[PDB]
């Protein structure tokens, strides 16, 4: 990354939410001048918005034309991390999908194009780099609004040099990511956010976790302070125009996910677990190395324990977020 | 295409417009039972919207929630052909252009996606035929909303079986073209809005054409009746989910077209041409020959003695649209 950081004025669109509120985490951290938080609290928790001198929180959709209005030119960094979270909820609901996680973006950008203090905008685009791509095999809305940013992002930086930097990432886990987050957005998933989480909380509730074919699926996972990292090397270093995976370059079955999650909780219950075939089953991180000196080298183990002591500690608040999606949850 | 379409009830979204009146057209003389025509003539004259027992006008937005739930599951066949025109007025105003021309098409699709009545649902998406798109060279918001209409063409197929056919044409001229058609746009090209009318237009007054660098430029021009039924072969015969090109195969370059325009006209005043070099410089129209029997037949010569031949008919009507944009194209 860099203390590039230091002493700047950043906005976090989306900076309320898991990523986000890590991502302010560690701005404040470097000792940034402040941060302004944008976020409806559509998928988040206000818990996870500081209350902090340094940190201004707009609790407002950044498609609020008001907001737009009012800003400034005094902001050193952007960072892009607003979405409708996720897949399943977009399907649901597609037209909310839009307004949450395409428009956003175009309006955003709409505002920032002829600030000059700009430095870096970074978008998180979801998962060498190309920017070639199909129009098959997006399976959401929320496929689609990923992708749309980009196309927004490129058109941007060369229309009218809005210095945008797209960060490609999945499969994110760690500390401040809660089942339940925010509103009712149509589908169990509201709860069940993540197979990380999902099977954490499970693990220390002594339930069986739920392997889904055996796990034999596999996934790269990447631990959350990895990933802000990764966003500030972004920001300091990325090229304008550019886009970057954040990515471990480790791949992890679910059964394994399983395996370490019981062993670590202490879950002593049975894994219906099956043998991975060639025919069951990703990023490559050495763009990010060469360009930004950045590497996610933070292993599944050590990030799994930091992530199971969080949900520990805070296990009685996530259970009471849980617990407002009751009679949703029971109607689907 | 056929007479699959005798008898149908048929909307058309954008069908005040362009391309979109000469639908309409060509759809009563094959005997459909209705078009509703869904337009707010923000591009479009009323005029070009016939006043018929059969064609039931809208004069709204198709994003607009009360139209959208009105509509009945009562259509065979819907064809989408609304867009903020075009590139130059979208790169002016981005939000103008998201809001008619990539929400349009996602508000329909979300309101179709049940309806059982549809047979086909044919989206114009601008210009053998590939599926892979690159985030690179999009000129202008337009193109990224076409682009989208795609990507959303594609899913609401995938996911909800909604019979979508992308019928894929540039460079689209003939008669119900007008200049300055509706409303200010934010640039010149409302009123000169394509190279053929404003070609056509400045012969009729004896005046030089202005020809951009010798006029060494080549494009595939096809005249709008070959494009209408293009339009209904989509409609009739394309594959759900599938995409065909609506092209004649035959390029012009723009010396070419001035030269042909000033003899019909009678324009006698200089041509400032060039010799096209390889440095100085389309889509296939096999599948659509092969698959729907469709082809695009009508030569440059004979397209642009019927443009003219309307144009001169219509040239006082035509100048009093025109005029409307004086002001702001004095300001300009
Ligand atoms: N977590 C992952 O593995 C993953 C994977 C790939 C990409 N991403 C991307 O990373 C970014 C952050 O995702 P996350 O996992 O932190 O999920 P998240 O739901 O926790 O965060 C998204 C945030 O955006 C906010 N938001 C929603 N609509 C908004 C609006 N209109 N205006 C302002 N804020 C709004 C939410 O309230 C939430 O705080 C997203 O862009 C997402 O697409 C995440
Ligand atoms: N003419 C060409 O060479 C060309 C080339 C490639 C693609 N296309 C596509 O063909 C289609 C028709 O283009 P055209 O040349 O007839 O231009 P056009 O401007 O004449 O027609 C577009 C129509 O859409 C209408 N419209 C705009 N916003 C609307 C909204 N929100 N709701 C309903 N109607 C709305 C306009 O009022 C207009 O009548 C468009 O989709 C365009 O992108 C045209
Ligand atoms: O309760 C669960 C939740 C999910 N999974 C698996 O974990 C993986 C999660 O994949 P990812 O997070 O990348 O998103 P997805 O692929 O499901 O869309 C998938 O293989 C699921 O089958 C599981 O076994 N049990
Ligand atoms: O008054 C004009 C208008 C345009 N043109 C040319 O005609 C072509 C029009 O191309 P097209 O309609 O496909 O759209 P464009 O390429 O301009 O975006 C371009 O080469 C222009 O330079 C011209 O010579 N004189």
New binding site residues.
Partial sequence: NASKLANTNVMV??????????LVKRLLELGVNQVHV???????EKI?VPDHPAVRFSE?????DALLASLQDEYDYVF???????NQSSIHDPLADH???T??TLKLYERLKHFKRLKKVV?????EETDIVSLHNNDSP?SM??IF?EFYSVYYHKQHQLPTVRA??????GPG?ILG??RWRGTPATVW??VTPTFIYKALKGMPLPLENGGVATRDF?F?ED?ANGLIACAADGTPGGVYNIASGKETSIADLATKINEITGNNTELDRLPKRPWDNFGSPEKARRELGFSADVSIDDGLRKTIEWTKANLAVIEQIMRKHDSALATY
């Fill in positions: 669109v989306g900076g309320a939410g898991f990523v986000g509120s890590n944008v976020d409806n609290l559509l998928s988040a996870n407002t959709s950044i498609t609020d892009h991390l607003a979405t409708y979270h996720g307004e949450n996680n428009l956003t978008y998180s685009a979801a998962g929320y609004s990923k940013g490609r990432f999945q499969n994110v886990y990511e987050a925010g956010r993540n990447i959350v990933v």
